[PDB]
Design a protein around this ligand. Structure first.
Ligand SMILES: CCCC(=O)/C(O)=C/OP(=O)(O)O
Ligand SMILES: [Mg+2]
Ligand SMILES: [Mg+2]
Lengths: 408, 412
């Protein structure tokens, strides 16, 4: 039983030597200087290099570093009996001191099934979320509150109702919206709930509200429990500013049991480099799903703020792979999304994804209501196999959206 | 009142345009379309670009990216009224969505004094730690347990004694030593304490034990409190695997009040890039001190695993700057350290530093006892105004260390 870590290494020195040094140094330390009884005692704790795939040198990389760097994908096995069954221990064991060892980038982690079972996965997942939103035959649609910093509850409820009237399935606080005297956490929840209930009585559709869960770590469970009691729909959480273990703690608390939406804020401090950090499929995908996120937002491959296509697809794959012993998490490609991108979003991510937009909603000529209607029309058109311009002939909101941002 | 963030940007599009976009987009979002009444009401929340220092375009960077990238240092002011007084809010506000915006690297964060005061800083700091171990003037000496994974308490106590008999001031668990049936957290503390007092009884040397504080986040305060009750000397903490806010929580809990040693594990996932992440001086220095670390271990600028000299010095400066409303944190340059490096360590970091012999101390020809003796002899030599080799001629432990690893020249 061992967790196998896969790394990308760049080095001017022997990579196999370094890999072997890591496997031994980061597990039992030394081996050949150990007495007979001690070797049989520590054998189960000895790390091992599982494989080394040589990639050959890159002129571009060499030029950048001004040196000749050998490249390779290295796989190392760390016995699970070497650490406690928790994410902080996993990270320290597989990329603690090693993260400081020059050019080393963590690409993936693979675990025995028995080990994975010590973790929760999403509480609701795609199926649970669809049941709660009441939408099963199409991708979901979400809008983001914009310009709320410094505004009051009257403004919040007004803005919340407009987005809901646009037909969005969910509305989330912007991740930079923190608790204040004007907008207290509990008041956002209770007043938002009432406002959405009024819209529900007018349309028959109840839009869900993902409220930002912020503040100090040791106060999170208490307010999350209050959120559950007050009837909050979803908890938005900037997990990377805390720790993966905190997300897991929120997921495992039976007194919370509210869907959790993980935001990518600060994940960019770890994922972009070619030589360092942790790959996004693992950092935003595999680990967040395992830790308990029901939704995971990540930069789409389309906007100004984006991810390479295969990187984004890799995250979605990790979130939905049904071979994992966890519920599937909702992939939410984000940033700069507008109606004209709906055809591509569905083509790339399928039906089990969420169309998420802030400016794409509020920037519509007719406000949030028009913005939401344009998106709903675009989604229906794609599912029906109709070009957006054809569908726009029968939907003014979509026409205005297409005229403003175009079709991709 | 605003927090000023300093960023390094690489971009093929207008940097000033992007800067203004960040100041506005990450604060109030819109401004020009707001009526006079709303502007005056939201003015206090409006972010602003403070300065933009244009740097020379780099041929090396351009070749790497295969494009022409303009470079600049951008400073943005974020009103403190926009976010709550906690580190997670600070990070999300100054480098949340922005960390995803292409080539942007956070270099520094400047806080108004009034804001800093809502944070603890180290509980003990350099002065407090020196009093706890009873060592003034000279740099401290610390060693790390070797190969403890899979071992039992009898092995731990025997190994702990060897290190203390070598004269080290502090011994720390390896950061990858997690709790187990063989080595329970509380037992390491109590058995370790007994072993160290026995050593004091025979040699007169006082040695502290930094025990690894691990496990799930919400069980940390309970065990730290227990550690305090049991008299633990220092709590070693892999802060970067937990979040800066957790370190602050441990520091602010009056029922703990035990020195905290922050380990750099995982910080390398954030600090090394030339275009992304967060600079070491901020991530390992300024923020850890503010959060409550009494000691901060970081890659020294000497070994295989290291940091550029100015980078390492920058961390030490942030940890010890007397201009901050916080106690100074002990800088502990680590990795590759050996007796032959003591002169350079003291020349570079001064007397208020800790020589971290790490696990290498066990590699001395005569084991940890000889290894510690070699280090203590080297420290005394420098303080006595003598070359290591002069002292080596009178100290066999030091001579063996020099013969084994050599002496690093300090002459400029
Ligand atoms: C990748 C997450 C982006 C985000 O947090 C946000 O609020 C986006 O807004 P729009 O780009 O849709 O206007
Ligand atoms: Mg946002
Ligand atoms: Mg270690």
């Amino acid at each position: 039983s061992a967790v196998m870590a896969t790394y990308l290494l760049h080095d001017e020195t022997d990579i196999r030597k370094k890999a072997e040094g890591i496997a031994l140094g980061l597990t039992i330390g030394t081996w050949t200087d150990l007495p007979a009884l001690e070797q049989e005692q520590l054998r189960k704790h000895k790390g091992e290099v599982v494989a080394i795939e040589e990639l050959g040198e890159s002129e571009r990389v060499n030029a950048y570093f001004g040196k000749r760097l050998k490249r390779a994908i290295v796989k190392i096995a760390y016995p699970t009996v070497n650490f406690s069954a928790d994410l902080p221990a996993l990270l320290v064991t597989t990329f603690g001191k090693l993260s400081l060892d020059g050019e080393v980038r963590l690409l993936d982690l693979e675990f025995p099934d028995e080990w994975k079972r010590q973790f929760p996965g999403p509480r609701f997942g795609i199926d649970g979320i669809r049941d709660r939103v009441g939408v099963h035959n199409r991708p979901l649609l979400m809008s983001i509150f914009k310009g709320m910093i410094g505004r009051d509850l009257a403004y919040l409820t007004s803005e919340l109702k407009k987005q809901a009237l646009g037909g969005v399935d969910l509305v989330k606080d912007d991740e930079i919206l923190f608790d204040s005297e004007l907008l207290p956490f509990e008041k956002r929840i209770t007043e938002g709930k009432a406002a959405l209930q009024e819209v529900y009585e007018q349309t028959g559709k109840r839009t869900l509200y993902a409220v930002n869960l912020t503040g100090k770590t040791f106060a999170l469970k208490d307010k999350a429990k209050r959120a559950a009691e007050l009837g909050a729909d979803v908890l938005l959480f900037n997990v990377f500013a805390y720790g993966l273990d905190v997300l897991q703690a929120l997921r495992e608390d039976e007194e919370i049991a509210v869907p959790i939406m993980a935001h990518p804020a600060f994940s960019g401090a770890v994922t972009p480099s070619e030589f360092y950090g942790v790959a996004p499929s693992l950092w935003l995908g595999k680990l967040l799903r395992l830790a308990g996120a029901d939704f995971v937002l990540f930069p789409s491959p389309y906007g100004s703020v984006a991810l390479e296509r295969e990187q984004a697809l890799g995250i979605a794959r990790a979130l939905t792979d049904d071979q994992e012993p966890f519920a599937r998490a909702f992939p939410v490609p984000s940033a700069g999304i507008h109606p004209g991108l709906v055809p591509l979003i569905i083509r790339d991510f399928g039906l089990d994804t969420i169309v998420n937009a802030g400016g794409g909603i509020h920037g519509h000529p007719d406000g949030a209501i028009g913005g939401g209607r344009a998106f709903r029309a675009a989604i229906d058109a794609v599912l029906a196999g109709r070009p957006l311009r054809a569908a726009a002939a029968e939907n003014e909101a979509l026409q205005k959206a297409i005229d403003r941002w175009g079709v991709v």
